[PDB]
Design a protein around this nucleic acid. Structure first.
Ligand SMILES: [K+]
Ligand SMILES: [K+]
Ligand SMILES: [K+]
Ligand SMILES: [K+]
Ligand SMILES: [Mg+2]
Ligand SMILES: [Mg+2]
Ligand SMILES: [Mg+2]
Ligand SMILES: [Mg+2]
Ligand SMILES: [Mg+2]
Ligand SMILES: [Mg+2]
Ligand SMILES: [Mg+2]
Ligand SMILES: [Mg+2]
Ligand SMILES: [Mg+2]
Ligand SMILES: [Mg+2]
Ligand SMILES: [Mg+2]
Ligand SMILES: [Mg+2]
Ligand SMILES: [Mg+2]
Ligand SMILES: [Mg+2]
Ligand SMILES: [Mg+2]
Ligand SMILES: [Mg+2]
Ligand SMILES: [Mg+2]
Ligand SMILES: [Mg+2]
Ligand SMILES: [Mg+2]
Ligand SMILES: [Mg+2]
Ligand SMILES: [Mg+2]
Ligand SMILES: [Mg+2]
Ligand SMILES: [Mg+2]
Ligand SMILES: [Mg+2]
Ligand SMILES: [Zn+2]
Lengths: 85, 88, 211, 104, 122, 33, 129, 222, 71
RNA sequence: CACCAUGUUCAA
RNA sequence: AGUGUGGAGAUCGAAGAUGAUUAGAAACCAUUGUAGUCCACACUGCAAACGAUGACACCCAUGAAUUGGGGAUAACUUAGUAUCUUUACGGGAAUAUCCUCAGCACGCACGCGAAAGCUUUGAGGUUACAGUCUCAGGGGGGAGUACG
RNA sequence: UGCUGUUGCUGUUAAAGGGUUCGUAGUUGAACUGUGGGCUGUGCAGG
């Protein structure tokens, strides 16, 4: 015998695999990160799926490159995920 | 107290069919795929004392291959099977 | 079905029972998955074979044993094996438990053709593999016979009421599962004690070539 | 009258595409859609066993160490020629669903 | 052709089953036994029965024959099969050691009874 | 054959016969008016 | 597009009951859908149900017993007077002994038996039995 | 003269099973028509030949003509059965169909239209039986309505024991082979519909073969 | 399939009106072509004068001379 | 892969 | 396919020509050959223009694949994994395991259908008949004809 | 005669989805502003 799935309270494994708009309550997949510029040496908050040109205030160097999904951070920079809330 | 009753209080039903313990579905006289399973009760020792618990499963569930899942749910509900292993 | 009304842990699995299962490789699948058998699979190996949850193995095995023990009049339980690997195992199971058995090809109409002089009407059907015992299962679906089946990770569960997830291919695995089932039925009946190990050997349950 | 085949005798699902440009039948030249025509890739020996033995004996180039060249041809037949040449035969209704995905 | 009909084949199988000990590999002696142990109008049928009876005996010496049930030999087989080893094979495997995969290792570690003693990773 | 009983000539040729008939009738009316 | 939320909800429940499920998820939700479920629940044809808030048109998870045979909306709403109740029971109910036609009246959403008892007509929403 | 070949037949002959309701409750198949003959008292069982028509199979030497017979059996008290059998001769077909009708007997639930006074007179709810293109809808009717149905379904309903019912039909109802079966299926559906009066949980009894297993074993032994 | 809207009466009325003409019996009753072609002119009986006696051969597979009169 | 066209009307 | 005006015209080829076959053969076969076949522009709007299956929306069981883009390496509180190439459209490329959304589909449970068959791709969820809109059909011919 | 079908028809193959798309009248059209407490008595209410 095993646990039957409950529609109102799904398991972690079942919920984690679902599309963001197919979850029981829809929500974002993205987040924000603190990025230290390899040339300006300064902290800038960068969207995880940034599509526009994000540049460091000091060096004026691009901190990321847009892709089809998540933005790609330039080599050398250090990033830290900020809390969702 | 089950079945159709008269104004005089007399039961007029020819008979009362069984109800599936998984889907609350009436088991018809022509099913021939519905089964009745008796599970022996066990006392403090590993020996069965005198009694059994009976499960009725409709034939449609067995044809769909969900009888095993239903029996698992019923036995867990009745306290026969343990839903998970104990803590290490 | 290790849970009893009083709450005693008498029917729970022990270390020796687990050792027998692991030694005979009763927990190994077929690297092929079935939707109904998915719940019984703990995980997958590096080589791709599926690992069967032993706790669910024991729960189904005890439940099957209690169902068999509930049958007051033995030989109303028929144990069928068309694999030719479980023919010895079911023969020894029938000896110790007192049930009927049939090995080899299942004759179509055995449970339905009532004037064939071989017409038998068992109350419980036990099969070694649903895929190869499909004919017996199909006929049982016409005469209200519940089915207990040894099922591997890819077995079809149509008209199967109690499925024991195990390795139903290997000679040693088939013998051990029937040996454990026979021992549990005897313990549930009370003809043997649980503190003393069963004197019978699983090698007799093992199938041997007629050479 | 009755729908004989689910795929209607061709590899063109209802919402895959509109038109497949036809090809000329290998035997008679009849135009048939490429996805419908019976396609066979044939690798034939230039010589049978006896003639190849004689030519290899007379050849300083070809022998046990160097094989003779073969003919490579993609042959697409119209349905009529495929049946008449016995490249393909009418089959029992239950056997019509049997498909092969590699040359046996 | 010289195919033996079911009448000859069935009678020959019955003759072998009932009088196996009295038969041998010689047609003429087998035929002489058959004249006494069978009732039939046809001498030709009896001769055909003897021919296939000798054929069955020759096949029996090499191995078992489907449809021929000889009580003494089948009991001789099952008594031989009953002979059990001194120690159980499962006990020998446990004594020599048990090796399980990583996934089995995780499952046993999660079990309430824990890891069995002589079960080790591989 | 790939069709059921036509119960007549091939429908394409019956359509052509009708088409020629319509052409003749509209020519006759044209010469009349 | 989806024209009737109530029809979508009732059809989803009827299909789940027909398939023998123990739970069914409903989307989207509405006040009318909730009131219909409560009338069903008050007569015992469904068990518990939970309304999940998503800051949008919410969702409902309904616990199904084995008693519901069929439920469905009636479209268009087909306003019904107090003298038309017997006509609707004859047309869309399996029997005069069980089953309910659910109406929306100025006294609220209720079954036809309660509507007749309170002497009010309305518009037919659906049925269940 | 009757030698039961089934455990149910042995129990019926030994009078361990006394009513068809026990057979119906556990949904056991009935393989011997003598079971129905014994369990139904003399005079309470009636049978009628519904339809006999010939069928033909073309051959190289003409055609082979057989006869298909439809037989209805009932007690006018909630039990109905239909048997269809083909034979080389009409009399053989009739006898075989009577046996088949007994083997196919089913219970029929009867109910009330309005007030529940006296014995049930109609069906409890609307039912529909389908066979081929033929579908028969049975609708509960008030007392005194009678059986408003075509003669073939009316005869089946009379044998089943229904007194008042409305009937509508669709499809090629002149195919009486399908019409008889469609009416029979609609009647058989009466006990499969879950009504609020059947919601209460029922105590599960023992299968009579299981209960009398030791006696059945003695019959097999001797 | 058909429309179902609460305010779709005009569509349903128009749909029925157009489709009734496909009923051959309805079209005959609601047109004048049959009445014009009917020699009786819609009456149940008509009086006449016999012009000649004729014998009409019966259709196959029958074979007879049906006695008739031109009126 | 030369060339094979036709079979009076009902009814067994 | 056909039409108009300019181009173009290798190949194939309605019409036609010749040679065979045949009782006849102004058919099938063979050798040819006009209009065409190709392009530009302008007409035509007649296809088995087919999935012979209207559009939008909801529910719906199973196994193996495939195209495109992303993500990761008493009803339980979380339950892996690589291989090959690698001085410039290169922090690259493709595989492997898992998840996911969108697309063309295959063998596959209900249920449906007169059946053939259909089946998250319905022809299922329908006499237990109501999500929305729209087109067409009402025995076979006459006839898609006559008239306008 | 549910063969005119609002109730209540049919349209893969029986008669019948328009070759495709745009599109006006017309028909149809997502959720939300919300349904109250307290006291007494009473009812296998229930966990
Ligand atoms: K093809
Ligand atoms: K097509
Ligand atoms: K695609
Ligand atoms: K508009
Ligand atoms: Mg959880
Ligand atoms: Mg054909
Ligand atoms: Mg084709
Ligand atoms: Mg596309
Ligand atoms: Mg096309
Ligand atoms: Mg050489
Ligand atoms: Mg043909
Ligand atoms: Mg046609
Ligand atoms: Mg006639
Ligand atoms: Mg002829
Ligand atoms: Mg010029
Ligand atoms: Mg040329
Ligand atoms: Mg057209
Ligand atoms: Mg399409
Ligand atoms: Mg079309
Ligand atoms: Mg793509
Ligand atoms: Mg599919
Ligand atoms: Mg409709
Ligand atoms: Mg017409
Ligand atoms: Mg009418
Ligand atoms: Mg009427
Ligand atoms: Mg019609
Ligand atoms: Mg058509
Ligand atoms: Mg609204
Ligand atoms: Zn060709």
């Amino acid at each position: 015998g095993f646990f039957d799935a409950d529609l109102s309270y799904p398991t972690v494994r079942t919920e984690r695999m679902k599309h963001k708009r197919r979850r029981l309550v829809q929500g974002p997949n993205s987040y924000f990160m603190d990025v230290s510029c390899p040339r300006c040496r300064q902290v800038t908050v960068v969207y995880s799926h940034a599509t526009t040109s994000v540049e460091c205030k000091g060096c004026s160097k691009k901190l990321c490159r847009p892709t089809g999904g998540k933005a790609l951070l330039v080599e050398g920079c250090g990033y830290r995920r900020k809390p969702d809330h | 107290t089950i079945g159709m009753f008269n104004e005089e209080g007399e039961n007029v039903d020819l008979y009362i069919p069984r109800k599936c313990h998984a889907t609350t579905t009436l088991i018809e006289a022509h099913d021939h795929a519905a089964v009745q399973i008796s599970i022996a009760n066990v006392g403090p020792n590993g020996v069965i004392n005198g009694t059994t618990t009976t499960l009725c499963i409709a034939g449609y569930l067995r044809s769909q291959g969900e009888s095993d899942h239903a029996i698992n749910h019923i036995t867990i509900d009745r306290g026969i099977m343990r839903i998970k292993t104990g803590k290490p | 079905m290790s849970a009893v009304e009083s709450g005693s842990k008498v029917l729970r699995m022990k270390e020796s029972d687990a050792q027998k299962l692991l030694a005979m490789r009763c927990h190994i699948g077929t690297r092929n998955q079935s939707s109904a058998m998915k719940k019984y699979i703990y995980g997958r190996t590096a080589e791709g074979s599926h690992i069967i949850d032993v706790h669910m193995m024991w729960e189904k095995l005890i439940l099957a044993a209690r169902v068999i023990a509930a049958v007051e009049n033995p030989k109303d339980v028929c144990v069928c094996s068309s694999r030719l690997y479980g023919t010895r195992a079911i023969y020894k199971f029938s000896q110790h438990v007192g049930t009927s058995f049939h090995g080899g090809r299942f004759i179509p109409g055995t449970f339905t053709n009532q004037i064939q002089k071989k017409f038998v009407q068992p109350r419980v059907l036990v099969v070694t593999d649903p895929r190869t015992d499909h004919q017996a299962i199909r006929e049982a679906s016409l005469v209200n016979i519940p089915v207990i089946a040894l099922c591997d990770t890819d077995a079809p569960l149509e008209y199967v009421d109690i499925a024991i997830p195990c390795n139903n291919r290997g000679i040693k695995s088939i013998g051990m599962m029937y040996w454990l089932l026979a021992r549990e039925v005897l313990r549930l009946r009370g003809t043997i004690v649980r503190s003393v190990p069963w004197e019978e050997k699983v090698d007799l349950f093992f199938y041997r070539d007629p050479n | 009258m009755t729908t004989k085949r689910r795929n209607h005798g061709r590899s063109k699902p209802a919402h895959s595409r509109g038109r497949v440009k036809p090809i000329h039948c290998f035997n008679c030249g009849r135009l048939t859609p490429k996805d419908k025509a019976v396609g066979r890739f044939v690798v034939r020996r230039m010589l049978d066993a006896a003639s190849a033995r004689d030519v290899a004996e007379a050849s300083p180039v070809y022998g046990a160490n160097f094989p003779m060249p073969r003919l490579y041809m993609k042959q697409r037949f119209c349905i009529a020629c495929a049946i008449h040449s016995r490249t393909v035969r009418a089959r029992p209704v239950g056997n019509r669903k049997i498909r092969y995905t590699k040359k046996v | 052709g010289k195919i033996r009909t079911k009448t000859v084949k069935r009678a020959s199988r019955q003759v072998v089953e009932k009088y196996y000990s009295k038969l041998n590999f010689d047609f003429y002696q087998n035929k002489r036994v058959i004249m006494d142990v069978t009732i039939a109008e046809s001498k030709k049928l009896k001769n055909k029965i003897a021919g296939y009876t000798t054929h069955i005996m020759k096949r029996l010496a090499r191995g078992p024959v489907r449809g021929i049930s000889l009580k003494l030999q089948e009991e001789e087989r099952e008594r031989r099969m009953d002979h059990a080893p001194a120690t159980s094979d499962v006990d020998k495997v446990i004594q020599s050691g048990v090796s399980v995969d990583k996934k089995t290792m995780q499952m046993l570690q999660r079990l309430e009874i824990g890891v069995p003693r002589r079960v080790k990773r591989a | 054959g790939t069709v059921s009983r036509p119960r007549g000539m091939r429908p394409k040729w019956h359509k052509k016969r009708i088409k020629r008939l319509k052409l003749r009738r509209r020519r006759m009316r044209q010469r009349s008016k | 597009t989806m024209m009737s939320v109530l029809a979508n909800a009732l059809r989803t429940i009827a299909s789940a009951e027909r398939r023998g499920k123990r739970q069914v998820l409903i989307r989207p939700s509405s006040k009318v859908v909730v009131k219909f479920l409560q009338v069903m629940q008050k007569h015992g044809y469904i068990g518990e149900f939970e309304i999940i808030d998503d800051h949008r048109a919410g969702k409902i998870v309904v616990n199904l017993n084995g008693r519901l045979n069929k439920c469905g909306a009636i479209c268009p709403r087909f306003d019904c007077a107090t003298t038309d109740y017997e006509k609707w029971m004859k047309n869309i109910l399996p029997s005069r002994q069980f089953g309910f036609v659910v109406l929306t009246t100025s006294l609220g959403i209720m079954d036809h038996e309660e509507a007749r008892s309170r002497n009010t007509g309305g518009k037919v929403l659906g049925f269940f039995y | 003269e009757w030698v039961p070949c089934t455990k149910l037949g042995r129990l019926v002959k030994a009078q361990k099973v006394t009513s068809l309701e026990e057979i119906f409750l556990f949904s056991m198949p009935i393989k011997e028509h003598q079971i129905v003959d014994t369990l139904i008292a003399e005079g309470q069982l009636h049978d009628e030949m519904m339809k006999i028509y010939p069928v033909q199979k073309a051959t190289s030497a003409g055609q082979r003509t057989r006869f298909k017979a439809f037989n209805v059996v009932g007690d006018c008290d909630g039990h109905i059965g239909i048997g269809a059998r083909v034979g080389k001769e009409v009399s053989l077909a009739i006898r075989a169909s009577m046996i088949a009708a007994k083997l196919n007997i089913v219970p029929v639930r009867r109910g009330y239209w309005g007030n529940k006074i006296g014995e049930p007179h109609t069906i409890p709810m609307k039912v529909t039986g389908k066979c081929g293109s033929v579908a028969v809808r049975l609708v509960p009717a008030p007392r005194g309505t009678g059986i408003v149905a075509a003669p073939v379904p009316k005869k089946i309903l009379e044998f089943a024991g229904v007194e008042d019912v409305y009937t509508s039909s669709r499809g090629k109802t002149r195919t009486h082979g399908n019409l008889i079966m469609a009416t029979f299926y609609a009647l058989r559906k009466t006990y499969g519909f879950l009504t609020p009066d059947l919601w209460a949980d029922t105590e599960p009894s023992r299968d009579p073969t299981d209960e009398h297993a030791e006696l059945l074993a003695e019959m097999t032994t001797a | 399939t058909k429309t179902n809207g609460q305010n779709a009466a005009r569509k349903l009325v128009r749909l029925r009106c157009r489709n009734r003409w496909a009923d051959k019996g309805w079209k005959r009753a609601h047109t004048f072509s049959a009445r014009k072609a009917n020699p009786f002119g819609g009456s149940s009986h008509a009086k006449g004068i016999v012009l000649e006696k004729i014998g009409v051969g019966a259709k196959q597979p029958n074979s007879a001379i049906r006695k008739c009169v031109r009126v």
